Amino acid sequence: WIFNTEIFPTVKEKAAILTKMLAFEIRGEPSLSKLFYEIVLKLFDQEHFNNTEITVRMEQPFLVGTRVE
Structure with a gap:
């Protein structure tokens, strides 16, 4: 779903x-x-100065992802 562009x-x-x-x-x-x-x-790999994500990936699962033992 995420890694392609479509009419979604x-x-x-x-x-x-x-x-x-x-x-x-x-x-x-x-x-x-x-x-x-x-x-x-x-999703954060293929972005250097970009918004191929949406900015909530920088908010919740990135911060929880720095904690995941």
Whole structure:
């Protein structure tokens, strides 16, 4: 979903569906959370001075991602 451009009309729906994936470490699933923080890290990889993300990826899962043991 995230890593391509299409007629999906806004990126806030991608943001709201990806921000829900912070329950993987709360419920106790390490592998799904590892994949999720890998794709958040890849979203921050292909950006130097860019907004290929939306700015809520810099807000919640980046900051929780600096804590993930």
